[model samples]
Target: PSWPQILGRLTDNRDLARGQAAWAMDQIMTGNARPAQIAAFAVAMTMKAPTADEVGELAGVMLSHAHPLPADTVPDDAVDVVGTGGGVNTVNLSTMAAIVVAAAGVPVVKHGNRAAGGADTLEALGVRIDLGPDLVARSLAEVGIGFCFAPRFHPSAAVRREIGVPTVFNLLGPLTNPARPRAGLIGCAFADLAEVMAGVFAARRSSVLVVHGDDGLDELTTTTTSTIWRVAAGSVDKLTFDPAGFGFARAQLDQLAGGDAQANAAAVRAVLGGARGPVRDAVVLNAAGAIVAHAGLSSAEWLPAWEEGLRRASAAIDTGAAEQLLARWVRFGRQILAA
Candidate 1:
């Protein structure tokens, strides 16, 4: 279907919304629509308030355009730890947690971009983000961590940069990791997206944990209660997360704000080196969430599982294992690059 047809269907009827949105996305990705037309479609969808089915259709189309990692390369239990950006700019908790998760022997395919967040901080930590699929697969297989740069895996995603607004693309990021991890811990900027994302993942029959901080951060927060939904086999259940219950007192948002890459790099190293304070607490909390996802943990099991995950994550840091994981990958990536 063409843009005008899709637009008319979207504006005139609710039933065709999901199909038209998917068709419109296909047209946009194939360069079949003008910039204005694409923008109009996006605005129309936003105005209508996209439903879980509509967003899922759009995500389906997006994934079709992605360059998937080799199926042979991805492990059965692999998981991706990621977040939708455009939330409170906190330090690189998810990226650091990826390293921690990897250190604990759960494979992590950390899909992201080199924005002012995780990617930049990851680069600062000496992890390479430009590797091709073979190298990325090797990294995941050998080191337990693989950083799949989003633009490298999904070329069509660059179109979103031109739109200059939050669109369905923002919600599609965590769902479209090239590795197609069996499980994931995905954080969204809006609290409402917790359920929406769980629905999206459930449609795929995926095991996932979707989280949003009550304070509006995409990551699990140390400062506020977080709303979470555990999704498995299309079933979703709401869950609660409290920092104090997990043994960490509440922290201020400012305590978690990230700075330039250099500053963030230092904080990541400090956290992995077992620094005692809010930063370590926050990273451990997020890491525990990732563990929950990778372990296929359900809401009923969350409290005890998270407690155990937190203890394991903290141990990874305190034992110097997490930092060593990063150092090993940094050196190994460089060696591959030099060769």
Candidate 2:
């Protein structure tokens, strides 16, 4: 059986490596990979630090099978802001920054789900900000930032579970977006994964800037150094830098906290109010990081460009553009419910 073959090959190290490559090919050629199989393959492959071929095959499967949202109507400058979110204990401030980045003229197809650390969801921030289901699509068209709730966008995946016991769907979610964006500014939680994912996205041909802040951030932080991998113009490189280089207030880990949606919403309000603290600084730094990847600023000029990006984001926040966007999204949702 394929299951025994997969499991046996997985445990054999060298043979396992080739088995994953073959399995990935099979997944791309077909529309589905057994969940039990994916879970077993992932656990083993992760332990093996997936070969480049293995990552490429999986990206191929994602590209071929995942229902990517059409971007033909999106402005040429639109981008997707996301992270390979897997419960790094980092707050969802990245979602907040997408608003700022979108406010600065770049449209956004920001995708995420409602689950983190076995107890995380966009509801933590979405409910507090009043982001209802219907409003999500409207927000993308109206405010230039659309929230793609993964489960709603990809319901067919549920059929797989009905076919058999659910095995490990969680691992499949982040990489497969029903509303896929070709260009993404994504972050990962672990330090070692920086390069591995760089290959994964590249194989998908996504123009992406993948990052993992050395201080446990999915974005740049003043608290510590961060690593980034740029995938564009047919080249890639891993780079590192500290937040102070950009004139941001130095932050420590404690300043970044998340317990619930109410607290996160409160934190967003505080940051927008221009409060002087680590929370505010963290938002600014992350916004600048998004800008760096989105705007294609020169590395030689990244520091000043980062500052300018923050100032623009701040202006949008202070002008209430961010708040207005949220309000409009809420009203749209209410109209849908009434219908």
Candidate 3:
């Protein structure tokens, strides 16, 4: 089958040719690739780096098949903050950042699942992860933020088995949001992958900040400088996120440790409730990055703009709007469950 050829090419450390990856994705998405082939394909991809265009071809096919939300429901300014999530287990940093980003005057339609910290963090924070398009739209409208459970939108998806390490899907997840937000803060677990993802997001006509923490965490970190590819309007600028340079404390990676979903959820609440330190710093910088992307500061030229993003993100927490929004969003979830 053609699957074998594709897998062979990947395992041989060669990139897929134009239109070939799309065909391979078509076979995989339709279940024609077979379980073993799919497994081999993922493993092969992991063994070799996929080109930006290859990932693009794969995601384009996947996005076309998604049960996506309506256009009007997703605001032009809406942003999705997500991580490749193949890094060390920590608190749901991106989800916590999205909550603050939303309260800071940007709409958010965070697309993720329960496997990692994202959906798990939101669930522990008392929000329902599985919601249909109508319900998702309602939340985005009323709460200024929403969670799109991957399974709900990708119900017909063929690749359901969990893969422990980062694969093409990690890149696709943030790229293929059901809401189709034009802006995003995508955290890559690996620095090399972030560069590949940058042009792809921009090629898809998205404005995004693709980042990788120097500590190897998926989310931006307080531990060390992070690599960022700030992309907008078909351009990408390589940049760095320096915690100390920005006047934020340089904490150890362990200081930002989050036990599990529930523990991460607790940390989210603590930060929103004015708990300051490494955890809060982690959340603030990430949310600030999201805000910077949302505001179109997708360039290293605006280093000070990143600082303003930090100030604004902190203001959302300082004015109590972030915590209040959490209550409002959680209560809305209860209302949905009760009905």
Candidate 4:
């Protein structure tokens, strides 16, 4: 379909919206569409506000065209803990949370990009960010945690970065993991995008928890309530939770404002070593959510279950288990880079 025709169809036909959007995106990925054409397409779709079916189609198309991790690499219960970037950049909360989750005996196949603050933080912590899918799977199998850097898994990801706008592409990242985790904890940059993301996961029959912190951070915020959407068995439920309800006091953004790769890496190390502060509390809060999401727990069960999850996560840090996992991850990265 021509880009113009796709834009026109998106204006009226919901049925045609998905195919047209998918086709247009494919054309852009293959360099058949001009920058202006792709930008116009993005604007039209964004303005139209894609339906659940359209979002699912776009996510599926992106997944099909991207490199995939080995099917056996991800266990049946593995979880991907990630966020849609372009939000208020804070310390790598999700990454730290993933470590805590993995340390708590859950497999985590985290997918992310440099824009999200995780890639750099991982690199700063001595993790090699350029591992291929096979090595990534190995890392996951052996360490219970691995990161699939987006550019390595999705070549067309560059096109989205080039556009430099908040298109549906940003919303699709958390959905496009090569590992294809069975469940996930996803943080959306915008509150409304949580529903859209839940729709995409629902269509795939995957379980996921989509979160948007009210304070504008992508991960759960310590300063405000967070909106959450839980999707499972093709159903979605809107939910909300406050940090104070979890026994945490509201914290200013700067307390969670991680400076750079080095600073963020240090914070992760400190948090994993049982440091007491907003950063540790934030990691524990997110890790608790991850544990609940991976277990496919419902909202009603989350509050009760999260307290236990929080204890396990904190115990992982207190007992130095999370710290050991970080060290193991670094060693594994070194082995891959050396090879």
Worst 10 residues of 2 by lDDT: 116-125
lDDT per residue as tens, model 4, 187-229: 8877666788888888778778888888778888898898888
Model 4 error, position 238 (Å): 0.8
lDDT of 1 at 247: 74
Model 3 regions more than 4 Å off: 157-166, 297-301, 336-339
Candidate 1 Cα errors over 4 Å, as ranges: 11-15, 157-163, 297-300, 337-339
Q: lDDT of all the models against the reference?
A: 0.78, 0.59, 0.80, 0.79
Cα deviation at 1, candidate 4, in Å, is 3.5
Worst lDDT window (10 residues) for model 3? 156-165
Ranking by lDDT: 3, 4, 1, 2
**Best of the two (2, 4) by lDDT:** 4
Model 4 segments more than 4 A misplaced: 10-18, 157-166, 297-300, 336-339
Supply candidate 1's per-residue lDDT for 259. Answer: 82
Best of the candidates, lDDT = 3
Write model 1 residue lDDT over 1-339, tens digit each, in one string. Answer: 676677777678554543776787788788787877877777776666556887777777878987887769988788878777664665477778788888888888878777736678888888788887888988888888898887788777344567767765655677677788878888888655557778888887778888888888888889989988888766888977788886788899888877888888998888887788887888888888888787773333667777787888888888899999999999877883531
Error of 3 at 307 (Å): 2.7
Alpha-carbon lDDT of model 1: 0.78
lDDT of the structure predicted as candidate 2:
0.59
Question: What TM-score would every model get versus the actual structure?
Answer: 0.92, 0.79, 0.92, 0.90
